[PDB]
Amino acid sequence: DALHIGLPPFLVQANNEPRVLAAPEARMGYVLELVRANIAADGGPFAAAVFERDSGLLIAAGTQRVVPGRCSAAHAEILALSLAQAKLDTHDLSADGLPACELVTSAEPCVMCFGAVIWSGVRSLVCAARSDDVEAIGFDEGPRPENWMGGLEARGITVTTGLLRDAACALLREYNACNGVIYNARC
Amino acid sequence: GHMNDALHIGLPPFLVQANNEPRVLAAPEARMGYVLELVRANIAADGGPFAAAVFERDSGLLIAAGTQRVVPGRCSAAHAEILALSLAQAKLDTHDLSADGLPACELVTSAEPCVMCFGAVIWSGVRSLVCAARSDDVEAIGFDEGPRPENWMGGLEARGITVTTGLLRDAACALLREYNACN
Ligand SMILES: Nc1nc(O)c2[nH]nnc2n1
Ligand SMILES: Nc1nc(O)c2[nH]nnc2n1
Ligand SMILES: [Zn+2]
Ligand SMILES: [Zn+2]
16 A cells, blocks of 8 residues: 555664764765664665755665665665655755755665666765775676766766765675675674 | 655555456556556546556566656655556565566566666566557657666666567557646
């Protein structure tokens, strides 16, 4: 009777508490905490958050819930964008009288999320890990169009990538190190 | 609807029914015909003119169905394909419809997928995509497919997703032209 993806407690918490982060690094810092927490709550090493671009108010956060949620569409970007839309009560994050919105993401978007970003109404995309980083640990980005960044820019969506990339990469390599069946107390 | 503790996209009555009534449609045109019934039911339930369904490829057991619920669900990701693929996964208790021991799954869709849905198809585990209306047909009533890679069809086929296109296209267009005429 519904499409229903449950949020683990830490994500409910993130989505409940008012929070304002002005600097790109502050915003991405927070998104990287959610990655760490999502991995500790049985999810993939990806998180994202929709902010008010100009005030830094957090609207909504998401994390990859593919396995726990039994749903291949539950990438961090889909959850973040959709929960932001559900909170603001509109399918269009650029609807009249909404502030401009920004998707802050732990990694460059896959081809699915790329499309979702375009349809979402956000005006800004801010990424940490690059596509090659993500692919290096076996997560596929899929076939995006050529010059997909230019693609976004031409729809009025500004793209920045590499923001706190080093910390992001460190979280990716930590996930990979502990993504295996032999028990490892250190994980 | 908005929820503290879930992303929750509710389904209108016809779609709750479609997802619970037993239905075996062996021939592909029987599959696409039923999907076009869902398109019409969706328009009457304030949705866009798009529907899709996951079938077991060989038997044509219907596993799940989705329709575009963008405006009434306040969700730009709620295309037909996303809901159909996600409800099937929910129904089969797995995020991968090609998981060992599941029969091969097929997504039958009213129109060729947009770039988002193209991506969702690849990650879903379906082994087959069957489309009615073409990309052109969708753009001609003002729906945007977005920037898909050159040769999106070959991209699907290259990872073992067979693509059929044009099936009951004229029937699907009749519904599209009606939707566009009635704004
Ligand atoms: N490539 C990729 N893979 C996943 O599993 C994701 N989850 N959130 N962003 C994602 N990106
Ligand atoms: N382009 C496009 N747009 C929508 O709103 C859809 N819903 N289901 N397939 C869809 N395809
Ligand atoms: Zn993605
Ligand atoms: Zn789509």
